[PDB]
């Protein structure tokens, strides 16, 4: 039995009935972070009822605040139903992305570590509903989270009414892996000192806490998380990982990093996977993770002993890795700590531990300002996520990307970024399959010489050099040279023609 | 009274010219100095003269200059005149040095002020050859008493191979006691220490910079003045901005979103900040607390009137009139002011913990509320980002304040797209101009634009901004943050071409 508090068993009801508690206009806070631990059955039932209402000319939309990304059963179903008027802080569902980019869903991608605090401040309004997925409910009414913690404790505190989905698909032995603190991290100032001085340090307990009188419904479910396929490293990712690992090796030999490096933050996807595979094969020992996510390559390193501990707010695992950790949850439970995201993404803690931040990007300009979010400056991809939390607070901020996109028709290094998420001050190292730019100690013009020479693709470097050269001669000021007449012209060229590469039918200064 | 109270260290006293000879071509020099206060004065002058002579003989002679923040004509000015600085960080306001920077003659990088010490220890600027630090006094056990700022001086003393102290008799001996220098690991090798500050008036350290006396290569007796802030009063535009902000604070308190005493306050320097402080001085919020980078004129008034109880900062930025008052009454003001290391005053962990209210200026913001603090037309440096990022991102509330226009109406402070970004949308919640106040909390980018355009933009520019936004909504590549890339930067180019952002 998953509901070990007898009194709360009387609140069990079907998903459809529970969804009726959610009203048009409501602000709904849910569990869910990197496709893990989001509610599934109540959102599906809600979406059906939303569509039915819309067909009869009746409005039915919610504001949806999450930990971070969810999955098809939540963002997907609600976006299909056109049921979300406002969304925050981070989405990866393609249907929801389309609603955002059509202006049908208003969106703001907050720094992930800040969301709980802004919720408590009231920026999203009054929370009507918290809808949270659970592994179990304990004897004294504690709520055991599932494959992520995210913002769930904050949403439970704020919401007028609470709905719990108890998912028997989630492994019972997840109980104990979470660390939930009752301290003031995101409440009213003055906040508490968050006393974390080791990545493996627990400060709290294993359960979310909530007044049982606020629980309006409990729904028994049995459904899987998103679990994206493993993105196998291609040669581009492998080259990027190779330059990065060589760099780490050099930092260690110059005593600027310990042989155990520092606590590591990375993502998911191709490049991160290549980096984790390189770390598994590399000369470094006693590694530590202090990140947003646990991904596949870590289980390997936790099992071998290459990595000693991994701190995160969520799992981001493939189907095969998901089965590996479930068959051995009692081992991995001792190696992993899942934290509230306002703790995993706490700038104070990230700086104190001296994390190495490794993040992706859409593009960077020649001065090393970074766009993480908005294609051509206007079309949302996913969101800033925790990349700003980590980039700004880290001991070392590293951005990694293929040097081109769209089969070479887009350069990831541009004269000016069409949107900025990370300013120059927040980015010290850039890595592409072309090489690694170490920007420490450099002015913007010096940053440009390094980025253009080390990171840019051969197809675009002469164009970049031409822009920079002419900017140096003609720019209003020469501290960060620009030609405002063409700074964004590569982006407009892409919009117009589908490529940033110029045609020989017209003049271009780099052909000559 | 003898300023060098350690008898043994008196034997290290030498001329500024001889001391400057310790500094070699290529050296990385860390100095005191923050908001025109407490920078070294006589050794940089002597160095500059020797640099010029060297250059004339065909000898290379340049240094890297790392400071707390801004300095003055004796340091940034003289060295820039001599073409003696190959790299400068993190914050300059001297006109001669600014001209070197914008000519590409001095390399510059404006780091977040709270991060500079940590990056210095990491080695980003290279090995420190020299620390050149101004002192009020040297204590009997060899402690270095800082002057009108603390800045990064403790870190530079730790790092540098050789140390030069300027003991400046111009500086008030009664400054001794006002500083709080922490022994702990804020900016050193990870894992760092927990910084135990949980109230803005909490002292956690001692009154002196610590340095191994064997590293002290020279002590120079000096007698010269800091820079002062302007006396000039806030005009009608600044007073209007302050009025909107104070009305906003009132409503926040009435809605129980701020305490009646508000929260610890951070304020930049300028006319607008002065207006806000004058507003608060006779405002309805009592028992105020400052947790800022700087102590300015307005704070002294409030610390005097009791309307403000304590002010924490790293430096002074005072007018001649205000400087005279504090120096006449240092007894009193010393008990009301704490001067901290800048990596503590600007610690994002502390700023968030205390829940600071950040109030900063700007060059411009775009319609989505991204902020440019630094680079005119995107390429010409003004001063630098300073501590505005430390505070904007970490604060409980991040507010940006500016006149809606500049250059007699020929520049709009609200533009379609910022030509350079220092603060992203996520780091700016409230904008105030003399036209009104935009509260952006809870809003998507297109919702932010409606508020910024209608509340903050000047009437001369508002229809142009609305026209841009409306056509972007129709024709932009994506509709989440609509832009027309062909004209996004066109107002800036129009200014470059014609001298005004207004069409013919």
Numbering used by the authors:
A (entry chain A): 3 to 514
B (entry chain B): 2 to 505
How did the manuscript describe this experimental structure?
Acetic acid or acetate (collectively “acetate”) has been observed in several AarC structures without being provided in the crystallization solution. The final model contained three acetate binding sites in each subunit, related by the pseudo-twofold axis. Acetate (ACT 606A and 603B) accepts hydrogen bonds from the side chains of Ser71, Thr94, and Arg228. This is the only acetate binding site not located at the rather polar interface between subunits. The second acetate binding site overlaps a chloride binding site (CL 515) observed in earlier structures and is located on the flanks of the dimer. Acetate (ACT 605A and ACT 605B) accepts hydrogen bonds from the side chains of Asn112, Arg120, and Asn125 of the same subunit and the backbone of Gly443′ (the prime denotes a residue from the partner subunit). The third acetate binding site overlaps the other chloride binding site (CL 516) observed in earlier structures and is located near the pseudo-twofold axis on the flat “top” of the dimer. Acetate (ACT 607A and 601B) accepts hydrogen bonds from the side chains of Arg354 (bidentate) and Arg354′ (monodentate) and the backbone NH of Val196′. Protein atoms in the interfacial acetate and chloride binding sites are nearly superimposable, indicating that the acetate displaces chloride ions supplied by the buffers used to isolate and crystallize recombinant AarC(H6). As anticipated, each subunit in the AarC•acetate complex possesses active site parameters typical of other open conformations.
